[PDB]
Enzyme design. Structure first.
Site, PDB file in Angstrom:
ATOM      1  N   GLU A  12     -27.039 -19.651   3.441  1.00 35.29           N
ATOM      2  CA  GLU A  12     -27.117 -21.038   3.903  1.00 35.29           C
ATOM      3  C   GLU A  12     -26.143 -21.467   5.012  1.00 35.29           C
ATOM      4  OE1 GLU A  12     -27.430 -22.042  -0.338  1.00 35.29           O
ATOM      5  OE2 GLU A  12     -28.748 -23.711   0.284  1.00 35.29           O
ATOM      6  N   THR A  17     -31.479 -20.805  11.397  1.00 42.32           N
ATOM      7  CA  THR A  17     -31.568 -21.954  12.295  1.00 42.32           C
ATOM      8  C   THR A  17     -31.190 -21.567  13.711  1.00 42.32           C
ATOM      9  OG1 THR A  17     -30.939 -23.422  10.495  1.00 42.32           O
ATOM     10  CG2 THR A  17     -30.865 -24.310  12.721  1.00 42.32           C
ATOM     11  N   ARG A 144     -35.816 -25.813   5.359  1.00 41.61           N
ATOM     12  CA  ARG A 144     -35.150 -24.640   4.783  1.00 41.61           C
ATOM     13  C   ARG A 144     -36.043 -23.703   3.987  1.00 41.61           C
ATOM     14  NH1 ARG A 144     -32.687 -23.543  -0.730  1.00 41.61           N
ATOM     15  NH2 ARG A 144     -31.441 -21.648  -0.353  1.00 41.61           N
ATOM     16  N   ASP A 166     -32.195 -11.189  12.123  1.00 41.05           N
ATOM     17  CA  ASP A 166     -31.856 -12.166  11.113  1.00 41.05           C
ATOM     18  C   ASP A 166     -31.993 -11.514   9.728  1.00 41.05           C
ATOM     19  OD1 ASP A 166     -31.093 -14.716  10.165  1.00 41.05           O
ATOM     20  OD2 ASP A 166     -33.195 -15.391  10.030  1.00 41.05           O
ATOM     21  N   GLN A 170     -27.552 -13.815   1.023  1.00 44.03           N
ATOM     22  CA  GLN A 170     -27.247 -13.833  -0.400  1.00 44.03           C
ATOM     23  C   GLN A 170     -26.751 -12.457  -0.867  1.00 44.03           C
ATOM     24  OE1 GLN A 170     -29.799 -17.595  -2.264  1.00 44.03           O
ATOM     25  NE2 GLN A 170     -30.699 -15.538  -2.374  1.00 44.03           N
TER      26      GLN A 170
HETATM   27  N1  LIG Z   1     -26.523 -30.833   9.302  1.00 41.18           N
HETATM   28  C1  LIG Z   1     -26.601 -29.508   9.530  1.00 41.18           C
HETATM   29  N2  LIG Z   1     -27.457 -28.767   8.835  1.00 41.18           N
HETATM   30  C2  LIG Z   1     -27.427 -27.483   9.222  1.00 41.18           C
HETATM   31  C3  LIG Z   1     -26.650 -26.884  10.190  1.00 41.18           C
HETATM   32  N3  LIG Z   1     -26.930 -25.535  10.294  1.00 41.18           N
HETATM   33  C4  LIG Z   1     -27.852 -25.330   9.395  1.00 41.18           C
HETATM   34  N4  LIG Z   1     -28.208 -26.469   8.716  1.00 41.18           N
HETATM   35  C5  LIG Z   1     -29.227 -26.587   7.687  1.00 41.18           C
HETATM   36  O1  LIG Z   1     -28.828 -25.797   6.590  1.00 41.18           O
HETATM   37  C6  LIG Z   1     -29.998 -25.221   5.949  1.00 41.18           C
HETATM   38  C7  LIG Z   1     -29.806 -23.745   5.717  1.00 41.18           C
HETATM   39  O2  LIG Z   1     -29.705 -23.058   6.954  1.00 41.18           O
HETATM   40  P1  LIG Z   1     -30.339 -21.609   7.141  1.00 41.18           P
HETATM   41  O3  LIG Z   1     -30.142 -21.226   8.563  1.00 41.18           O
HETATM   42  O4  LIG Z   1     -31.706 -21.641   6.566  1.00 41.18           O
HETATM   43  O5  LIG Z   1     -29.493 -20.722   6.298  1.00 41.18           O
HETATM   44  P2  LIG Z   1     -29.383 -19.240   6.446  1.00 41.18           P
HETATM   45  O6  LIG Z   1     -27.978 -18.898   6.763  1.00 41.18           O
HETATM   46  O7  LIG Z   1     -30.465 -18.779   7.349  1.00 41.18           O
HETATM   47  O8  LIG Z   1     -29.681 -18.754   5.063  1.00 41.18           O
HETATM   48  P3  LIG Z   1     -30.212 -17.462   4.513  1.00 41.18           P
HETATM   49  O9  LIG Z   1     -31.606 -17.295   4.996  1.00 41.18           O
HETATM   50  O10 LIG Z   1     -29.214 -16.391   4.787  1.00 41.18           O
HETATM   51  S1  LIG Z   1     -30.248 -17.442   2.624  1.00 41.18           S
HETATM   52  C8  LIG Z   1     -31.190 -25.588   6.832  1.00 41.18           C
HETATM   53  O11 LIG Z   1     -31.855 -26.726   6.274  1.00 41.18           O
HETATM   54  C9  LIG Z   1     -30.541 -25.990   8.138  1.00 41.18           C
HETATM   55  O12 LIG Z   1     -31.276 -26.956   8.853  1.00 41.18           O
HETATM   56  C10 LIG Z   1     -25.723 -27.680  10.899  1.00 41.18           C
HETATM   57  O13 LIG Z   1     -24.925 -27.325  11.774  1.00 41.18           O
HETATM   58  N5  LIG Z   1     -25.770 -29.008  10.499  1.00 41.18           N
HETATM   59 MG   LIG Z   2     -31.670 -17.387   6.682  1.00 41.98          MG
END
Ligand SMILES: Nc1nc2c(ncn2[C@@H]2O[C@H](COP(=O)(O)OP(=O)(O)OP(O)(O)=S)[C@@H](O)[C@H]2O)c(=O)[nH]1
Ligand SMILES: [Mg+2]
Ligand SMILES: C=C[C@@]1(C)CC(=O)[C@]2(O)[C@@]3(C)[C@@H](O)CCC(C)(C)[C@@H]3[C@H](O)[C@H](OC(C)=O)[C@@]2(C)O1
Ligand SMILES: Nc1ncnc2c1ncn2[C@@H]1CC[C@H](COP(=O)(O)OP(=O)(O)OP(=O)(O)O)O1
Ligand SMILES: [Cl-]
Ligand SMILES: [Mg+2]
Ligand SMILES: [Mg+2]
Lengths: 331, 189, 189
Positions: A12, A17, A144, A166, A170
């Protein structure tokens, strides 16, 4: 010339993103399938807040006993396979989201597992409920969906190729990262700066930022990444500031060492940035710099960047800065 | 020429969890990347042979992701059986370091037995040293019917280990394909 | 560099043949370790000779398991026929070894065609080996084979260009892997 970039970071942090911005910035029928995903975020957000109300310590109480019936509603449909999403759902959801109790519970959301896109989707229910609803660019950024497996994305910036990878952040997913370590131009490690007062989903105890720090140390000191440089993205810069300025959750109550910390001299604050915020964001960066300082001299470096992944505007700036680091260093 | 020995300690150490981890996709170059990790594992195991304490160990071959070795091919008279166990612990030390860097949870499953074997080459192609016999068949059965993070030994082998100061536990009586009912033990860490 | 160098190279359009003795653990129990290695050698020497004539490259020998692949190192569009011809000769060879020795030897031949990775692993005691899902399948075709005949996949039949008469194999009912993966098998005549 071709560059192979790997995104690393806990669950997360903001990895997926960042790839969505590359598409929006340098790459670009399917937008209609993401609706179903967006509606799920909404459902998962409302129910998670409601279900948490009675379990917190102390338990938060509703301000309007009328909503007790709507609470009963949300729960009766919690684990329904394929939910058809009838017009009632949105109504109940909206009323609940306006109840002070449901709101007070949301403020203490750092005490249970809640998705980041909560406040954003709940605030635009009246928009998502329409049958003629078309997801905005910002809507897709916030949406998400858990990442499982590895995904490649090819793009171009001034006739120079980039392959983006990507992966899932987890614990159980990390085991697939190894598959990309060999022949990587550089690493993009993403961190959820704003997650200093939260705990990870995997065990419900390990501090999120601490999980980030440990993971960084594991990556920085890896035996197969001895010469690979790491571009650090201190993501979620917006929520960090909101939290610092709100003063509800104190940073020194989680990381005691903060009490003995002053802003650095070379610090470059943003025009209109609060001293408290500055001091906070630079503190988080310094924690990760203390790790990168102690080892692998000259063979590899670390380049920090303040980041807010859902700001298509911000990502252009810092990605162009990365394009600089990559070309300037002959990587 | 094929030589005969009386007391040889054979060993098979598998990594059951690899077969699952291996997958063929476009990202991992048709599974090449997975083989790159095995090459790291098998290599880390191999360099233990350079240690002075393991000078008596002989790596025979590698079956899949199963490491096969034996001690006593150079001949406290039975120390060579006790040493093979020491090597088993060493492979775990190495496999654990690989886990720390690849963010995995690979566990070793060992099987050791001892007895008469026949050393030598076979066939018409390459000069490949290999050891045969019932002793080797049973060692392999001691690995295939074992438990993760455990060193399973035969009865006779259990006696010798105890004399050298090792402790053992009775796994039970299990039917081994082809051999019938054998009573087996588990070395105590 | 950071990853040990890896001497491996991908190869499409190849055939993998696997053979195994039935009840070998059982056989090593009846006769002396010497006679076993001798009868086992009498067989493999002939196989290694037949491997050259049939344009097959022998890989390894794991106890009673024998495998070689056609179409390596140099590409050969005649591949699948080589392995079939190899197994053909193999069966007769086993027949004669059983004849002059008086030892109950029987083998299962399993063939499959697809891509294969190949080279060596580790640092010490190198032995040219092959890896890939398809290799894993050939091995299972042998386990799920019928004693005395040649068990092949549909993938192999498509590289035969209709030169050998076959019959329904039913490998799905003799091996869990072939069923769960929906493999259609065939037996040569
Ligand atoms: N407000 C805000 N929300 C953010 C930011 N970066 C990511 N998010 C939100 O956090 C959520 C999780 O981000 P995501 O990119 O899906 O996680 P991840 O690191 O890809 O997760 P994973 O797939 O390893 S389990 C998404 O809803 C995304 O829009 C940010 O800088 N600001
Ligand atoms: Mg991810
Ligand atoms: C390394 C992974 C993988 C999947 C690759 C592969 O094709 C194999 O190496 C074969 C089939 C293959 O290399 C041929 C020899 C032998 C000994 C039959 C192998 C083992 O069965 C391996 O599994 C075990 C259990 O070690 C297996 C299946 O493992
Ligand atoms: N030198 C060796 N190298 C590698 N593996 C060996 C060696 N000698 C023996 N083996 C192994 C371990 C036992 C195995 C032979 O038994 P196998 O498992 O094939 O059963 P089996 O022959 O009794 O019956 P079946 O093949 O019909 O199931 O081969
Ligand atoms: Cl994180
Ligand atoms: Mg057999
Ligand atoms: Mg066998």
């Amino acid at each position: 010339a071709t560059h192979r970039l790997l995104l690393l970071g806990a669950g997360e942090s903001g990895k997926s993103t960042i790839v969505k911005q590359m598409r929006i910035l340098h790459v670009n029928g399917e937008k209609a399938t993401k609706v179903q995903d967006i509606k799920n975020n909404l459902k998962e957000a409302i129910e998670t807040i409601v279900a948490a109300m009675s379990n917190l310590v102390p338990p938060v109480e509703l301000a309007n006993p009328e909503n007790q019936f709507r609470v009963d509603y949300i729960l009766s449909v919690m684990n329904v396979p394929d939910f058809d999403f009838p017009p009632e759902f949105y109504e109940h959801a909206k009323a609940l989201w306006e109840d002070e109790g449901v709101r007070a519970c949301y403020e203490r959301s750092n005490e249970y597992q809640l998705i980041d896109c909560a406040q954003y989707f709940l605030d635009k229910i009246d928009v998502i409920k329409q049958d003629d609803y078309v997801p905005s660019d910002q809507d897709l950024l916030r949406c998400r969906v858990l990442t499982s497996g590895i995904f490649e994305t090819k793009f171009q910036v001034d006739k120079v190729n980039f392959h983006m990878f990507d992966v899932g952040g987890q614990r159980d997913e990390r085991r697939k990262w190894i598959q990309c370590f060999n022949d990587v131009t550089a690493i993009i490690f993403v961190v959820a700066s704003s997650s200093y007062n939260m705990v990870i989903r995997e065990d419900n105890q390990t501090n999120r930022l601490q999980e980030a720090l440990n993971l960084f140390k594991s990556i920085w000191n890896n035996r197969w990444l001895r010469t690979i440089s790491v571009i650090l993205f201190l993501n979620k810069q917006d929520l960090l500031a909101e939290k610092v300025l709100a003063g509800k959750s104190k940073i020194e109550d989680y990381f005691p060492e903060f009490a003995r910390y002053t802003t650095p001299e070379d610090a470059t604050p943003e025009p209109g940035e609060d001293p408290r915020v500055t001091r906070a964001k630079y503190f988080i960066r310094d924690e990760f710099l203390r790790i990168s300082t102690a080892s692998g001299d000259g063979r590899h470096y670390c380049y920090p960047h303040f980041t807010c992944a859902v700001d298509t505007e911000n990502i252009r700036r810092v990605f162009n800065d990365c394009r600089d680091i990559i070309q300037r260093m002959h990587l | 020429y094929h030589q005969s020995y009386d007391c040889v300690c054979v060993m098979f150490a598998s990594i059951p969890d690899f077969k699952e981890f291996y997958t063929e996709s476009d990202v991992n170059k048709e599974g090449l990347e997975c083989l790159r990790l095995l090459n790291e594992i098998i290599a880390d195991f191999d360099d233990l042979l350079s240690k002075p304490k393991f000078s008596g160990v002989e790596k025979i071959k590698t079956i899949g992701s199963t490491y096969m070795a034996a001690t006593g091919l150079s001949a406290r008279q039975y120390m060579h059986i006790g040493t093979m166990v020491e090597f088993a612990y060493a492979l775990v030390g190495k496999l654990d370091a690989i886990n720390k860097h690849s963010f995995n949870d690979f566990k070793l499953r060992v099987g050791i037995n001892h007895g008469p074997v026949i050393a030598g080459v076979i066939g018409a192609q390459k000069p490949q040293y290999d050891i045969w016999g019932n002793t080797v068949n049973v060692a392999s059965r001691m690995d295939s019917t074992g438990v993760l993070d455990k060193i399973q030994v035969t009865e006779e082998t259990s006696l010798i280990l105890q004399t050298l100061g090792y402790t053992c536990t009775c796994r039970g009586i299990i039917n081994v394909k082809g051999k019938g009912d054998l009573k087996t033990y588990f070395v105590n860490t | 560099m950071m990853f040990h160098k890896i001497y491996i190279q991908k190869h499409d359009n190849v055939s993998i043949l696997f053979a195994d003795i039935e009840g070998f653990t059982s056989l090593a129990s009846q006769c002396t370790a010497q006679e076993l290695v001798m009868t086992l050698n009498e067989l493999f020497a002939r196989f290694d000779k037949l491997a050259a004539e049939n344009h097959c490259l022998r890989i390894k020998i794991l106890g009673d398991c024998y495998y070689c692949v056609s179409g390596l190192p140099e590409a050969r569009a005649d591949h699948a026929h080589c392995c079939v011809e190899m197994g053909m000769d193999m069966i007769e060879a086993i027949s004669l070894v059983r004849e002059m020795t008086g030892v109950n030897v029987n083998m299962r031949v399993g063939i499959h065609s697809g891509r294969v990775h190949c080279g060596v692993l580790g640092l010490r005691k190198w032995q040219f080996d092959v890896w890939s899902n398809d290799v894993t399948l050939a091995n299972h075709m042998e386990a799920g084979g019928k004693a005395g005949r040649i068990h092949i996949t549909k993938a192999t039949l498509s590289y035969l260009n209709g030169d050998y008469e076959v019959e329904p194999g039913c490998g799905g009912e003799r091996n869990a892997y072939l069923k769960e993966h929906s493999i259609e098998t065939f037996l040569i005549l």
